[PDB]
Amino acid sequence: ERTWQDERIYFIMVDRFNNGNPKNDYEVDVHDPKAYHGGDLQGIIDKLDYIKEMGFTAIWLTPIFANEKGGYHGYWIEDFYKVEEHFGTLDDFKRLVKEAHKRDMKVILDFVVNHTGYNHPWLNDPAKKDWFHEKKDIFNWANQQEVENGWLFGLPDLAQENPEVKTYLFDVAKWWIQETDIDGYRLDTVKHVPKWFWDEFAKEVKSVKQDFFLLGEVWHDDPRYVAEYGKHGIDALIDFPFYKEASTIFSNVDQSLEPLYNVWKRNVAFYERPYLLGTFLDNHDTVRFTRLALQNRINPVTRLKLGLTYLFSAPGIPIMYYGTEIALDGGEDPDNRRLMNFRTDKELIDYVTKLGELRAKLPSLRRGDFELLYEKDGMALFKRTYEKETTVIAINNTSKTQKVTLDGELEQGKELRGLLAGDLVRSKDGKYDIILDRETAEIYVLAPKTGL
Template sequence: MKQAFFSFVAVLLLSFAIPAQAATNNERMWQDEAIYFIMVDRFNNMDPTNDQDVNVNDPKAYHGGDLKGVTAKLDYIKEMGFTAIWLTPIFQNEPGGYHGYWISDFYKVDPHFGTLDDLKTLVKEAHKRDIKVILDFVVNHTGPHHPWLNDPTKKDWFHEKKEIFNWTNQQEVENGWLFGLPDLAQENPEVKRYLIDVAKWWIKETDIDGYRLDTVKHVPKSFWQEFSKEVKSVKKDFFLLGEVWHDDPRYIADYGKYGIDGFVDFPFYKEASQIFSKADQSLDPLYSVWQRNESFYERPYLLGTFLDNHDTVRFTRLALENKQNPITRIKLGLTYLFSAPGIPIMYYGTEIALDGGKDPDNRRLMNFRTDQEIVDYIKKLGELRKQLPSLRRGDFTLLYEKNGMAVFKRTYKGETAVIAINNTGKTQKAHLTNDQLEPGKELRGLLAGDLVRSDQNGYDVILNRETAEIYVLAKKTGLNIPFIAMLIAIYVLFGWFLYYAKKRSKQTT
């Protein structure tokens, strides 16, 4: 109860701190979302009746997570400020397919995860909380021993069994068997019709809000063009987030011409995971990533930004390998993730600094009984992103960068947010001129409570080592009498509440 009270106070104080001219929220768009990414089997086990083949000591076995487990944690996810969840594939898999990518039946929920009704309940409960649901969808391949492989009527449903050797040869990339998995021939009209029909069926049946499209570059662009058109005909504003694993944003951006809305931003990941996992790294390369994104993408604000995922080494591991405090490093990385352009995607377990090396070690079982330091920090970031449209829709300008001390500005409809990140091992000062920020105002810190008043030369932002602050530019204030009065009233009421509760407790005992 105390925790709920102080959470309420924090939100109330934030409403006082944000200037009155702050832009109001318009109709919700996908660039306004923040995504919590869940590997279903490794998240939360709520239904022991579906715990077949579970062995939590084997990193390649099922660990018991299920759809009911996700539903049970929706409030937890919402409280951190996330507005959407992305689930690894929930379709029926071959034995050992805890991850969901060895599909054996595209029309069934894997019994390890629950039932179709469990999925419908999850979506319904998520929507009650204004949380959108994105399913991971695989059209490139099936499981290694799919029944179709032995069906003579479907012999032309697969490409000839060949590995990919030349990754610069697009035909080989699209027709080769990725990791030895049977490669579906989407140019076959029957295959194409089947995959599109099943994609539409899940939308109609469960009311999901989007697909994260797996292995996009291994499937012909002509297929994606028809696929996107048909699935979007089923539900308005249905979102397609493509995984095109490539270092060149021009290569990735080209798929946007074929109906895919946004993409998982691997060039961002490459820079962010290195920069924030170690102190004294310049943030210039990250800003360069944004400048390229602005040039190459039609909708750069729909790129999914991330620090790690189920296919990469955990960010915590990178920090530990660099002999850094992972909690400190995660806080800095998430500050940038939540305040820079793009849709932030956070992999489950980041909020507890979950460790992990290469697959499958990066898919450890979630632990909900751990220190809350990062969780509380994420709640602040989530609330700020919700309250400040400039952090979701604003332009993005680098005002200052020197060896890891960086200051960015975002503006949207009269609202100006300033993001300062000290990614160095020492206290740093950044001077911002009157040309960079409107003179005669103050920077009101909302993350850590800092206050920077301008002088005739501009603004001096001072941050301790390895810390960050998010400011709004506001009119200079004197003594805020209404705010102080409200603060006193809140704590008087809370004192009365504690006294009354204690008195009532004595009466009942």
């Protein structure tokens, strides 16, 4: 039976994904990178089969709550109880969950507790002036109390210390769960809100749906700092240490994959739940991974194949940003948030589809241990075992044909059947001679010998 370790997440910025209703396009302007561009909830419903067909088992939507002007991303909330008018109606959103659930797919909403939009009405309500912390910037980022109390980017910082604010937040969190049947929240700006609040928050949402899933965003590349949050009722965290390594390493050839395995060992070290760490190559707050490839003047398609191979075969919960499967280019926000294009070449859509199939099929990729057998200068071999399954992930991130002989690391007299590109490596005298041509990848299941 299904666990969050088994999940593959397709991540969507609602506005930037699929304009499925042309009639809710209010002052949409696709030529202003800070306006609404037209994507909506109808948009997403129409693309459920496309998403599911790729092997994705869950969708994370950027926030859907009514936002003030310029809130095309959803993070400057104006009304916690209202669906953003450009996206749809509440009904449209209930139908979306229904449509995902029909497809066996889970729905995660982005959910914000830290702050309101800049022009939220409460800012004017005299009864609510103690709803907000004193307006101050964050200066010492090493002062965690300052980080929790400051107004990030000048965003009205909610005061969770006030029981009225806390209650309001729990009541909205519980409400969307009881009203729409979502499966989880991706928690924005986790690090700007105090830990004691997450414990209570955690208690409050799971009191309403027992398996309610929480994926927290703690923006930091120190797993020691990120891992603490996991101790406060948050089931999974976004793995920025993974991202920082994966992004850099897979965007150019002849770079060692070894740092990624140390991110693993450190995840085992520091987190209670090392498999429930959301892994990615990019997201809506980062430069597009394709732009890192373009910067290094190297073909982004071949970069993406290697990266996504590792993403889909390593521990954690893969989170592919909409667009990755078309080599969508994009610099810094907002330029990383381009309209999805559905009429491009399908090479990476089919490659991703194979990957998600293999991660579905091969419970060693969702649940197995994770061993580094070999790493030189980008040529890497990993091994993963689960019950009677043993899998071997080979990624040649080097500019040369590589041959690596395994000799005791696998049980002798079998063969490795390459399930990603059709390779075959037969034990010959205990040894497996793994040969990969430059910048290719393979995923092998270890299996009984065959022949003519």
